[PDB]
């Protein structure tokens, strides 16, 4: 008995709903790793990255959260929340660089 990429994503959603943001990351990244090894599956990466980027933000990994938000926005440029997240991160980053210029 074993876990498909779909299973891993579902387990990631269980972790997320209990605010286990590290386990969210572990399961979601495992879902992506199974896809990348050529597992055939029907889950969408956009939804995976939506959970993953938020979970990584919860861990205080702002750079990696930004990375993941940009990967999401490459696949779904429409995505409303990722667009809002991007604006937030760019705001924070613009603030940091404003500080170093003063």
């Amino acid at each position: 008995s074993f876990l498909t990429a779909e299973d891993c994503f579902e387990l990631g959603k269980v972790a997320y709903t209990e605010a286990d943001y590290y386990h969210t990351e572990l399961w979601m990244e495992q879902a992506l790793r199974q896809l990348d090894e050529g597992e055939i599956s029907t889950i969408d990466k956009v939804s995976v990255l939506d959970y993953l980027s938020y979970a990584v933000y919860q861990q205080g990994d702002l750079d990696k959260a930004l990375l993941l938000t940009k990967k999401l926005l490459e696949l779904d440029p429409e995505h409303q929340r990722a667009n809002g997240n991007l604006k937030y991160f760019e705001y924070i980053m613009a603030k940091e660089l404003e500080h170093h210029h003063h």
Partner: peptide, 6 residues
């Protein structure tokens, strides 16, 4: 502030 899935 950032917004995750509901």
């Amino acid at each position: 502030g950032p917004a995750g899935p509901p």
